[PDB]
Amino acid sequence: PSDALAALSKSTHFDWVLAPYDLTASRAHTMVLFRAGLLTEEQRDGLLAGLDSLAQDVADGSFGPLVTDEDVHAALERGLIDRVGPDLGGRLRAGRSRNDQVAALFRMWLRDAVRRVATGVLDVVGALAEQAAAHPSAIMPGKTHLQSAQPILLAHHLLAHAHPLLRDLDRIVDFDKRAAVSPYGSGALAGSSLGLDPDAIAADLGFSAAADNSVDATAARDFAAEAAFVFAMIAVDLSRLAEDIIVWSSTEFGYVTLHDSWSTGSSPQKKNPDIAELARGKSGRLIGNLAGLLATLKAQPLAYNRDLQEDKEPVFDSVAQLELLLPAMAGLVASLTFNVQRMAELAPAGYTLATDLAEWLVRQGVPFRSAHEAAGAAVRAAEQRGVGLQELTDDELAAISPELTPQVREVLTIEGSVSARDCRGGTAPGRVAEQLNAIGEAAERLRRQLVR
Amino acid sequence: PSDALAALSKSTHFDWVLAPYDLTASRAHTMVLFRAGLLTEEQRDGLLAGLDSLAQDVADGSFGPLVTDEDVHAALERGLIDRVGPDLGGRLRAGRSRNDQVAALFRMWLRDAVRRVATGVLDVVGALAEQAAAHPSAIMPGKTHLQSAQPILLAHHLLAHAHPLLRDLDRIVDFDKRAAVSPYGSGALAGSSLGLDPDAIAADLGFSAAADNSVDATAARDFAAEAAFVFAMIAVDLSRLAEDIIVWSSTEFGYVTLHDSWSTGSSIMPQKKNPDIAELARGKSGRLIGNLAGLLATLKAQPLAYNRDLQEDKEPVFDSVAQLELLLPAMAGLVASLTFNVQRMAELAPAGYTLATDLAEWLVRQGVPFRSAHEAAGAAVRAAEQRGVGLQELTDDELAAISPELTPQVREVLTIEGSVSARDCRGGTAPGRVAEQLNAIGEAAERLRRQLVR
Amino acid sequence: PSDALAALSKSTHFDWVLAPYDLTASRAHTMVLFRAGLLTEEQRDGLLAGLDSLAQDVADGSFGPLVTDEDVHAALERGLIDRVGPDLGGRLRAGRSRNDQVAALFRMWLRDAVRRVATGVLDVVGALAEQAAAHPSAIMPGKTHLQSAQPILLAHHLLAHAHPLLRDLDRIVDFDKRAAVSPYGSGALAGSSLGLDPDAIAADLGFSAAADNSVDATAARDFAAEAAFVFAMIAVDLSRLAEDIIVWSSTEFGYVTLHDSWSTGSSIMPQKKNPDIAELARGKSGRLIGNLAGLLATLKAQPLAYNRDLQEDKEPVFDSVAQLELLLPAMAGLVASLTFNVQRMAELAPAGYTLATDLAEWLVRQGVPFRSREVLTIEGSVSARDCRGGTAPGRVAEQLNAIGEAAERLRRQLVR
Amino acid sequence: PSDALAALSKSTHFDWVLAPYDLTASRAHTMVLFRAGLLTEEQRDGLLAGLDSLAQDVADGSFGPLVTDEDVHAALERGLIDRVGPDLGGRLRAGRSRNDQVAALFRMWLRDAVRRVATGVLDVVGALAEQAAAHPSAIMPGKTHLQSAQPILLAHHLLAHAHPLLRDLDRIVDFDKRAAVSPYGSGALAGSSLGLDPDAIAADLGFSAAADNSVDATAARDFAAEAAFVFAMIAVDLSRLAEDIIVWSSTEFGYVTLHDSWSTGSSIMPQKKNPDIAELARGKSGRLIGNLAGLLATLKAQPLAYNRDLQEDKEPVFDSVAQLELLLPAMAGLVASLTFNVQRMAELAPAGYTLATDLAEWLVRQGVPFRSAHREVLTIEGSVSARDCRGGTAPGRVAEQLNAIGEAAERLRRQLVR
Ligand SMILES: N/C(=N\CCC[C@H](N)C(=O)O)N[C@H](CC(=O)O)C(=O)O
Ligand SMILES: N/C(=N\CCC[C@H](N)C(=O)O)N[C@H](CC(=O)O)C(=O)O
Ligand SMILES: N/C(=N\CCC[C@H](N)C(=O)O)N[C@H](CC(=O)O)C(=O)O
Ligand SMILES: NC(=[NH2+])NCCC[C@H](N)C(=O)O
Ligand SMILES: O=C(O)/C=C/C(=O)O
Structure with missing residues (x-):
């Protein structure tokens, strides 16, 4: 890899927060491999113990990514290979790809x-x-x-x-x-030829089901x-x-x-x-x-x-x-x-209660359009006198609509407005x-x- | 209102599609106002009849927006008044607003x-x-x-x-x-002083529920x-x-x-x-x-x-x-x-040796550790490539050199049909x-x- | 073409607005074809006159697109062909694509x-x-x-x-x-083997220049x-x-x-x-x-x-x-x-003692380091x-x- | 300040890249304060010397922000007040806001x-x-x-x-x-009571001109x-x-x-x-x-x-x-x-008979109308050359x-x- 390419491809500065999930995934992935008969118990337990160690050293900040790590995946394989051998360490990438791995971790x-x-x-x-x-x-x-x-x-x-x-x-x-749908099992895109179990590892990692399409699940x-x-x-x-x-x-x-x-x-x-x-x-x-x-x-x-x-x-x-x-x-x-x-x-303020006056008139049987009209004549009646609608005289109430009567006053408060x-x-x-x-x-x- | 103002505010060119919905909604609200005592049966059936008439004239293209019309809302009330007069049609405004009207039409x-x-x-x-x-x-x-x-x-x-x-x-x-939550009965924003029933009109209009907050339903x-x-x-x-x-x-x-x-x-x-x-x-x-x-x-x-x-x-x-x-x-x-x-x-x-993965997974089945099966696959790819053949045509000696674990039974997995089926x-x-x-x-x-x- | 393809491919409903630009450019292209010895004067004038008729009728509302017209370009060729015949109307299309064309009309x-x-x-x-x-x-x-x-x-x-x-x-x-760069004359993407002239048509249509790359000017x-x-x-x-x-x-x-x-x-x-x-x-x-x-x-x-x-x-x-x-x-x-x-x-x-800052900035003009009546008025304050x-x-x-x-x-x- | 408020308000994780520029401008602002008689020479040099020490410590990285620094501006004031003391470092604050500074710095x-x-x-x-x-x-x-x-x-x-x-x-x-337009000296929003000079500091800082409106320049x-x-x-x-x-x-x-x-x-x-x-x-x-x-x-x-x-x-x-x-x-x-x-x-x-266009374009030069048209140029070399x-x-x-x-x-x- 060239300088420019490494800098561009390098993702550990944002993807490191996936580490803990990557380890939990890898742990359940170890079990799938062993259950498919591809690891001895002892190869199994070697990896389990390398991983627990690596989860420890990650959690407390003892293991961290090197500058020479492209992504969280490569770095945790540096640290797993460090812990168990390169032979044992490498067995763990069987039947999975970076593609199904990353999708899954991102979901978790x-x-x-x-x-x-x-x-x-x-x-x-x-x-x-x-x-x-x-x-x-x-x-x-x-x-x-x-x-x-x-x-x-x-x-x-x-x-x-x-x-x-x-x-x-x-x-x-x-x-x-x-x-809650897991792509673990899909590998690069088509699935694995190896005899894994996508549903089991999906249960382990806590998803509801495994994907119905490996291509769809990774893409x-x-x-x-x-x-x-x-x-x-x-x-x-x-x-x-x-x-x-x-x-x-x-x-x-x-x-x-x-x-x-x-x-x-x-x-x-x-x-x-x-x-x-x-x-x-x-x-x-x-x-x-x-x-x-x-x-x-x-x-x-x-x-x-x-x-x-x-x-x-x-x-x-x-x-x-x-x-x-x-x-x-x-x-x-x-x-x-x-x-x-x-x-x-x-x-x-602004004669907001005007609409209560118009709705009052509807309840006496005035058509809304004319009550709306009457409300407005009253807003001007009040406005021009520096007064509230409640304070209009009976007479000036009578001038706006004959239907308007002193009892309408009993609904021209904000308390009564909210309550109606x-x-x-x-x-x-x-x-x-x-x-x-x-x-x-x-x-x-x-x-x-x-x-x- | 100025031409500029009026040209900007005019929404009939897009909002005319909500007209059936509007007419239908006014049918339900005609019924709500009636049930609350704010229309006689006369007035009710007059509105119903005029909305029915208006509905058919809209559906077939006899009634349509004019340039005068600010919204479909203005449009339908123009032609409702035309059908049943200014007294009765203007009653439809009671207890409702353009604010709830439009949220519920666009929802519908x-x-x-x-x-x-x-x-x-x-x-x-x-x-x-x-x-x-x-x-x-x-x-x-x-x-x-x-x-x-x-x-x-x-x-x-x-x-x-x-x-x-x-x-x-x-x-x-x-x-x-x-x-499926209806805003009807929220009016401008606060709800209404009149005695409407939002649950009823909600049900009438196909909604599952009326809203729990008028301010929210309208905003x-x-x-x-x-x-x-x-x-x-x-x-x-x-x-x-x-x-x-x-x-x-x-x-x-x-x-x-x-x-x-x-x-x-x-x-x-x-x-x-x-x-x-x-x-x-x-x-x-x-x-x-x-x-x-x-x-x-x-x-x-x-x-x-x-x-x-x-x-x-x-x-x-x-x-x-x-x-x-x-x-x-x-x-x-x-x-x-x-x-x-x-x-x-x-x-x-x-092509490009896509069966490589299959080869390496085969070694993993023999107990070879993946990173080693990988390198053996890579090696097998070049061995074939220089000779320009398939992985399958690697000879037994060629296969054996790449890996002692790699015997000629591998050859019966290096097919695209097997790959796919596996x-x-x-x-x-x-x-x-x-x-x-x-x-x-x-x-x-x-x-x-x-x-x-x- | 299927009904669905025709419903999907059709753009007359919005691109009609380019119609008058299309005509101004067809006029300019007529001249480019003519000058390159690919039209007679009889043909040239036949086209100019057909393009003039169409244009007058387009601005009139006399001529508009039809349901089976895919775009503005097809629609306008149909109308030129009605006016000037399928033979003479065929000739404009030479040396030019919808690609260079649409890109250019849109710029104008x-x-x-x-x-x-x-x-x-x-x-x-x-x-x-x-x-x-x-x-x-x-x-x-x-x-x-x-x-x-x-x-x-x-x-x-x-x-x-x-x-x-x-x-x-x-x-x-x-x-x-x-x-103000014209793509006119880049055709599909490569230019035309016909002896056109991007610069002349560019200049005719009010552009500062023709494009330096045919692929780029169309894409x-x-x-x-x-x-x-x-x-x-x-x-x-x-x-x-x-x-x-x-x-x-x-x-x-x-x-x-x-x-x-x-x-x-x-x-x-x-x-x-x-x-x-x-x-x-x-x-x-x-x-x-x-x-x-x-x-x-x-x-x-x-x-x-x-x-x-x-x-x-x-x-x-x-x-x-x-x-x-x-x-x-x-x-x-x-x-x-x-x-x-x-x-x-x-x-x-x-309101809110906005004039506090004016007081503190008076402390500064009189020695004291930035800590904390001629400028405790809003008139004085703004004037400072x-x-x-x-x-x-x-x-x-x-x-x-x-x-x-x-x-x-x-x-x-x-x-x- | 609540923990929540401080968490949210904190800017030092991204705005620390403005530190060199902050410093360069405070330098040019010490001069502006000095030319208006609001600083002495011993003061002016104190600051410049203080804004020099702090520039080196930032450059090699000995001075950075603390958890409690709201922003690069606070941080740099704290570091200056450490080097030249509280009384002197405070004077440099006069006739500038965080508002006009951040505008300017960001532009630089x-x-x-x-x-x-x-x-x-x-x-x-x-x-x-x-x-x-x-x-x-x-x-x-x-x-x-x-x-x-x-x-x-x-x-x-x-x-x-x-x-x-x-x-x-x-x-x-x-x-x-x-x-290339400087907001420096526009202040919080209204310009400054103090006799500063926007045109001069703009020039100090490599701008082409000072802003025509103090509300605008800052907002x-x-x-x-x-x-x-x-x-x-x-x-x-x-x-x-x-x-x-x-x-x-x-x-x-x-x-x-x-x-x-x-x-x-x-x-x-x-x-x-x-x-x-x-x-x-x-x-x-x-x-x-x-x-x-x-x-x-x-x-x-x-x-x-x-x-x-x-x-x-x-x-x-x-x-x-x-x-x-x-x-x-x-x-x-x-x-x-x-x-x-x-x-x-x-x-x-x-491939795809791409030379068909050339075919048609040839028989066009043979007078045939295109639209009906659909070996010198039936080669790709001839085709591109034409x-x-x-x-x-x-x-x-x-x-x-x-x-x-x-x-x-x-x-x-x-x-x-x-
Ligand atoms: N490299 C790769 N996927 C990307 C890994 C995750 C990446 N950092 C991301 O965030 O998407 N895909 C494989 C190669 C691989 O499995 O590593 C391919 O299809 O070639
Ligand atoms: N006018 C108004 N909203 C218009 C709704 C229709 C509009 N086309 C839209 O969809 O926003 N709001 C009211 C006025 C009213 O109730 O008509 C207000 O509170 O002032
Ligand atoms: N569709 C098309 N050209 C552009 C059509 C312009 C389109 N209507 C638009 O508005 O962008 N096809 C060209 C050939 C052509 O029709 O000129 C090709 O396949 O290269
Ligand atoms: N009024 C203020 N608090 N202004 C602060 C300016 C700096 C602020 N962190 C920004 O980048 O915009
Ligand atoms: O601290 C400042 O400079 C500005 C504050 C504000 O505009 O509120």
Whole structure:
């Protein structure tokens, strides 16, 4: 190998994190070979003992890759040959290739990683759930187009960010079932002539089944693309929550005060929401890793091509980011203080209660279009006097619609507004309470589905 | 409203496809408002009748958007008012918004669209399986790094493009569970003061459930983004099959001959016969990867709840669907139409000494340690190569020099037919295993199909 | 050809837009064939007249593609042949391919497009500079992390969105050089044995030069890719302006008040006034990055020379261009029509002790190392920042003026 | 600062490569503070001497960041405050933010980076050019759709990968002009109260001009998005070469044989020589497409001025550059190492009846109309020779192509040196 080629081909700086899985795989692979009659017991136990030794020296950082190691696979054979002979050491590559090996290890790594990610997603859900639970009554101006639209419970807004994250958990569970198929046994592409047992080693390493096609099992990286999708969808959902927090932390909003432990200053007297901003900017990053991996998987002729080595770094970088991001966001969310007096004073500002007036008129029998019309004449009636809709006189109420009567006042508060909306998925506290329970059960239900 | 404003906001050129869905939804919501006491029976049956009338005039092309119309939503209410007057038709607005209306229409539209997409995937899977079945014995050099590695059955190679596409159907089924939550009754964002029933209208419209959070049901577009992923992935899986066909179709390879009906000619070169279907699919895989990235970018950093940005969710998904709707049957037809030159694939199958692995595995069966069987194989390859013969034609002395363990019984494994048959484990290229693999593909497709009908 | 192949191969539905470029190039090719002694004057004039008829009828809506026309090129040959006969109509096709042809028509289209985009980009710059000129001294809280940081002049903030666009305009000038190379006369991929002339036809069709490599000029699509990036970059530049407008317009900020004619409402909440223009701009920049990414994936791993794949060059560039063609004037209209709430901005400018930094920077001018009343006013504070590019009014008026001169200089180079 | 917050905020694992540049600029900033009478000479020399000691300790590597250093900026302040004490090291802080510094530093870093990238591109053109030179007359079947279309010179095909790369070089020059604008002294966002001089420090630091708008200079990241585009276009350009090479190397093609030193093999298949470099080129174009698209997604919808998001500008660009720095010398090498099997290519050149176009083109010169048309030029040598216009595959034409490539390459090389 030339200089340039070694530098390009060298992968130990990112793939070393596969080492432990490579050893566990090799150990179960030893058993398959011995059970097919291709190793003496003693050749078996020699390798078992060389490997346990090598897992030890790896775990504590005593064995590491040399500069002259191309990849995790070559380096652990340096260290295994060091431990048992070259003759015994080399027996271990019978009936497997670097191709089925790498795919499998990458799957075992990633099946753990989604669970680590899953742990973090539940943190943020629990953190949002907690905050919503501690504010069962705080009313804000609910937004569409960032304009005051209707008053809602802070809790209902807040849980609207938990619901997507749970769907992401649902996706992890969906992903992991496709993830749990082992290519160990496929060798380079066609299988082995030797008498191995793909199903046994698949059981050992903890997959659900072995692949039905050796070519497909070594070539396809759709499982990696799907993971990459799922991690991007999580980061994008954090980006939505981050946008909210950032804007909420502004001097102009003043909805939240940031905690010092979860905020940052400047090189003078600023409290910035760095964590939220980094979640946001990183969502862009993890869209890149996904888009780029698909581009890489594109137009790949069967079977394995070296191109496919590029599957890992994108997924690795995606999983790392979320491993930093989720605990931070959960912390940041947990640490938020809400300025409830500030949120409520705004809740009706912009005459958000106009729609309650129009819906009131529908209940008396006015066609929506005309009630909508009447609501607007009243918004102007109120606006021009610096007053709230509730404070319109009976007479000026009577001028807008004869159907408008003093009893409509009894629905022009933000408290009554939020409460009227008690259909499934509405912002009435009774519904938010049930919604909050459902999240509890979905979280737990999903957690258990992952433990299996 | 200014022309500029109005020209940008106008969405009828793409969103007119949701019109049946809109009309159907308004039928269910007519019934919801009635059950809550907010229409007399008169008014109910007047709306029902006017929606029915409007529905037929849309279906056949008498009613269509005008330039005045901002969205299909504006369009249908124009012509509903025309059919039943301004008093009664304007009542339909009660308890709902464009925000919930549109999330639920695009959902409805999409569930059908993956169903159609799924039918097309199933086709391609069907054409791969059929050719696999028709050529159960054809042997080829299997490739890695597009270099000949070990012999494989064409059937085996073919079916490897089926399993990804069955995983994408799986992904479709998974997607649809999440797609089946209705936003109706969420109104602009908070839900409604009126006494509607979201569960009822959810059931009426084919959904499995109503949403648990109005703000979320109206703001979230993760289902759309997911849709785009499944399509993207389906297009990339098609790109893989595409690359192979294109390569196989070269003069150099000569693995397949393209059919006239499934290939295109040149406008200055008389005798060119190109694989354009494969090539367009490869091309459009980039395209559909863009629509997904772009979609997720648009979803990035949305503050809750609805924002006009979310309009941009439909076009990329529509595009990805329309391209798959073209591409799938075309590739199924392409695959089905191919002729395989089995003599060409076979003469190349042992070439570059692909049976080396077989030789070395044979020594491993005699108890020779693999790294040593490797070196002996390598040595056997050169021994034959310089003489320009097959491994089989290594003479007994030649074989004995390479290794004392290597006796002339090795010679009865150095055939492409033996090589291929020896891989009898689950997954392998042996014909008994391909036969089972082909049954599984059959059962899995049926199973996947039946859960899409539910 | 099967039904499915015909449905898949057909591109008339989007490439029709190249029809008039195809005719201008057929005219120029007629001359190239004629000059090389491959046409009589009778034949030449027969073709020129047929091409003129067709062209007049194409612009009329009298002539359009048909269901069984595969592309713009087939469609137009059919119509020339109706007009001038199958014999004389046969001759144009000589020495030329769909490959060199389609690549060249697309370049000519892309070069008019980028100018239309340049016009709209300038308008937004102009809309931005008009508003600056109309608020020359107003002071706002200057933001980073969307947190109040230092006071700045509104004009400074507004022009901070113009420079990005001036730089995008710069990119269009750069692009256009790489763009102005003609593939005409490279045929399929190798050139023609017929005695054509790339240079003459290049010059006839407004290009700076003919291509130096026939294989490369028919295969390469990096010009398309560069266009997608520049348009994607314009959309994101727009999207940063969009985010500021949207937030500015919230009840909570009340920095600006949207104008009735440039905002839309709500079907149920009467009184809404949404910045739909800003919001669509923001959303569409996503779409347009997506167009870029996807175009690059299409180009990736493409063996030479031409592949059917390279038909996907067009539609994404077409969409980007269409979107910017809608977005650009809308956003300029949104920006011209804002009302700025100057007083509400002046209240908040000192809010959060943004003037702390001005105190600490007074400690420095009086000895003490960077630790911690003439400059504890927002007027004094902004006036202190009078180096180049700072917020001082002196510099903003010179900057506002430089913007005017940069804009026109970049305008000059597009007409050339 | 919570553990979580610090974990996330930490930048020293990637932004430490900005340390040399950070130091070079603090030097030029000590001068700016001094010329405005905000430093004494004994102070000014204290710092310069302190910013000298710290530059050497960074260079040989005795000074690096601690676990607690948020970033390269903090780290270098800590090291300076260690060398010249807390009081003096603090003065250097005045009239600058982390905002304008990182903008500037990244640009300095990037201008260096594109120069290194450009050198590798030139290497890859050189390689291609060399192989044309060595195969001046070899004829192969020219392909469109990977179907044999018309015969061309191998030289004509090879060089067709060179023009793209030259155009990418052209984009680098065009890029560099926008890159060469300094934000120094624009501050957090508003410019500085203190009498600094942006134009002078820009010049100290090798920039061409100081920025016209302080909000813009500190918040805009289009320069980074341009760079990412250019890198991703280069990588896509390389993947098109890479695809050719991979397909050529197949047994079926036999167009090229791979070299052992620019080849990799199999742990379980002795005969195997693979095109791993080509294949990693290909795979990594996907990756660099990713970094561009993501970066743009990151820059999308940023309100003015600086936001923490903008920290994400560096890692994807660092990565893209990192990858081309490994892939350019490896590809140039792969290309130079290759054995072209000219006999094999020549056999195939007329295969598929590729000389039919020539047939039709001859009877066109016999007055027959083309569209009906479908031995001097029924040879591949005659066929390629006839295509003698600018751009064609005619021998004397490729030779002129090839000398134009060498000149354009050096012309473009000159402009990077300015
Ligand atoms: N080399 C190879 N696969 C790559 C090993 C794993 C690689 N580092 C990756 O990450 O994809 N494939 C075999 C050779 C082998 O088994 O080592 C081939 O098909 O030639
Ligand atoms: N107008 C609006 N959304 C439009 C939905 C249809 C649009 N084509 C889309 O799909 O985004 N939102 C409401 C107004 C309304 O309820 O009509 C708002 O909150 O202001
Ligand atoms: N399909 C094709 N040429 C380009 C068609 C242009 C296409 N519609 C597009 O828009 O890119 N085939 C050429 C021959 C030709 O038709 O000119 C070939 O096989 O080399
Ligand atoms: N306000 C700030 N914290 N600015 C820090 C600038 C450096 C930051 N790590 C970046 O690269 O963007
Ligand atoms: O620390 C800085 O220089 C900037 C901080 C900020 O803009 O918040």
